[PDB]
């Protein structure tokens, strides 16, 4: 459950699936986070791709004709078309509807594990504010908001700064 | 002061999908599945022109119906049309005709 | 003079994806023949702009 | 479709500043990344790309003579060139770098190219 | 930072002959790679994105085939529009860079 205690979602963030917002004193944006973007389009095509090349089909010519006189096996065919028609929706139905579910959820878990991460990192330094947003204790510049994006995030060298306005 | 936030993209999509546990979901970014659309002509199967008998039925070609004086050395498949009713011109009995149809649609 | 691997008695189709609504009656290497309207896997995310 | 020109002086002598425009008709400048592209008549070298909001990122070779900013008032932006030389004559290309789709994020949209001499 | 070796570097085949363009990346890219084809006095435009997925407008005589590290460009019947240099790109990582191009005259 991170999208929709993230509510919703940024028409400013142009350039990726996830990614961060800032703010600092040297200014504010959107920022995408390729890696995670391009692993989940590259996993989620890997997917569409195997629902639809997996389909090897026999050469077939599904038509056939009958006389007067063998209405009998006419119905056997048309018995044959129309169970294979039921198999087909079925099962094309609920292999959309199921697939579907798990991946929102995997998208729903990327971002979980990407405001998991730097939650991790962060410790006391930041409030959680709601809403997936950080409020920094301390100034953090582009570069310090950098570090966490790729995940080599110092807590220490900013603490006791954040304990002064912690009180 | 100093802000940071996670978040994920939104578009102007109208796309809605289904899942199990929701209905008309709308999304970013879809495929569709599912074929919905031909070209509304009768093409080359395998390269291999189909055969087409006009006014005539298998029965008219084959026996030499008078009106079926208007064939290739091969076919991928035959084609008749809704109308198609130059077949025997002298009444009687076509032994296996659906037989010889099976058996001469792709040669 | 168009070619085609799958063949139905109003129209060829393109058999890039698994399954089709055009026609029961096909003549080739078809996709498989459903009555469904739409099938549409979500590739994309929730696109909620709040 | 989305239109996008290139204006800019077509000779701006060595050492020198060399500034390019590009309007853009059929879409807003502020929703969008922008990305110049150049190539000496040689092959295509991608320039950088800037966004309103808004990270830009440069290419190395030339990232620290460059510079790029939007014009939201006018729907028009811009590149500088600070300190050029031979090796800047180019023909110089605008273009919008999509949203990101499943593809994801690729140039669709390029402007006519405008020429650029560096000459006493 | 990533290079794009492609080859051949020019090409002559009469109209209907089958055409191969390859492109190879320095290090894997998976599937982060466009072809454009520039026209002379002309805006290269996008031919193939994401390694093999034919642009919206372009014909099916194009076609786009690998991942990671190789990559190819196939003309399966060539028509005389088709003069061009097309030019392969990755977009893996930043800077973008593209391959030196390949330049493809029809042999009447």
């Known amino acids: 459950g991170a999208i929709a205690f993230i509510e919703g979602g940024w028409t400013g963030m142009v350039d990726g699936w996830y990614g961060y917002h800032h703010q600092n004193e040297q200014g504010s944006g959107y920022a995408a986070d390729l890696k995670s973007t391009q692993n989940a389009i590259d996993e989620i095509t890997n997917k569409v791709n195997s629902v639809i090349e997996k389909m090897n089909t026999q050469f077939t010519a599904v038509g056939k004709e009958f006389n007067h006189l063998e209405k009998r096996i006419e119905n056997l065919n048309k018995k044959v078309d129309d169970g294979f028609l039921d198999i087909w929706t079925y099962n094309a139905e609920l292999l959309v509807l199921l697939e579907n579910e798990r991946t929102l959820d995997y998208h729903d878990s990327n971002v979980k594990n990407l405001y998991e991460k730097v939650r991790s990192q962060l410790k006391n330094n930041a409030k959680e504010i709601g809403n997936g947003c950080f409020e920094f204790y301390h100034k953090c510049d582009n570069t310090c908001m950098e570090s966490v994006k790729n995940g080599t995030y110092d807590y220490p060298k900013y603490s006791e700064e954040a304990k002064l306005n912690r009180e | 002061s100093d802000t940071l936030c996670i978040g994920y993209h939104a578009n102007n999509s109208t796309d809605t999908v289904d899942t199990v546990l929701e209905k008309n979901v709308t999304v970013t970014h879809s495929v569709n599945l599912l074929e919905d659309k031909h070209n509304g002509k009768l093409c080359k199967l395998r390269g291999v022109a189909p055969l087409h008998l006009g006014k005539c039925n298998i029965a008219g070609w084959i026996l030499g119906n008078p009106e079926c004086e208007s064939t290739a050395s091969s076919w991928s498949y035959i084609v008749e049309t809704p109308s198609s009713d130059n077949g025997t011109c002298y009444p009687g009995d076509f032994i296996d005709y659906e037989e010889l149809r099976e058996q001469l649609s792709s040669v | 003079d168009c070619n085609t691997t799958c063949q139905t008695p109003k129209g060829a189709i393109n058999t890039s994806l698994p399954f089709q609504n055009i026609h029961p009656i096909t003549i080739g290497k078809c996709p498989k023949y459903v009555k469904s309207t739409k099938l549409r896997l979500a590739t994309g995310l929730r696109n909620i702009p709040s | 479709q989305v239109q996008l020109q290139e204006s800019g002086p077509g000779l701006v002598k060595p050492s020198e500043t060399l500034s390019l425009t590009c309007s853009v008709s059929?879409?807003?400048?502020?929703?969008?990344?922008w990305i110049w592209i150049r190539q000496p008549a040689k092959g295509l070298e991608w320039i950088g790309r800037?966004?309103?909001?808004?990270?830009?990122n440069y290419n190395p070779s030339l990232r620290s003579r460059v510079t790029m900013s939007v014009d939201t008032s006018k729907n028009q932006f811009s590149l500088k060139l600070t300190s050029v030389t031979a090796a800047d004559t180019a023909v110089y290309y605008c273009?919008?770098?999509?949203?990101?789709?499943?593809?994801?994020?690729?140039?669709?949209?390029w402007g006519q190219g405008t020429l650029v001499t560096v000459s006493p | 930072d990533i290079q794009m070796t492609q080859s051949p570097a020019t090409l002559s085949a009469s109209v209907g002959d089958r055409v191969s363009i390859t492109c190879r990346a320095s290090?894997?890219?998976?599937?982060?790679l466009a072809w454009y084809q520039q026209k002379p006095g002309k805006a290269p435009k996008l031919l193939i994105y994401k390694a093999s997925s034919l642009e919206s407008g372009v014909p099916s005589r194009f076609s786009g085939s690998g991942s990671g590290s190789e990559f190819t460009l196939t003309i399966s019947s060539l028509q005389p529009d088709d003069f061009a240099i097309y030019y392969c790109q990755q977009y893996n990582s930043y800077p973008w860079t593209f391959g030196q191009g390949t330049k493809v005259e029809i042999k009447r």
């Open positions: 290090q894997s890219i998976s599937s982060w």
């Open positions: 059929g879409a807003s400048i502020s929703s969008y990344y």
């Open positions: 800037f966004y309103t909001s808004g990270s830009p």
């Open positions: 273009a919008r770098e999509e949203h990101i789709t499943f593809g994801g994020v690729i140039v669709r949209y």
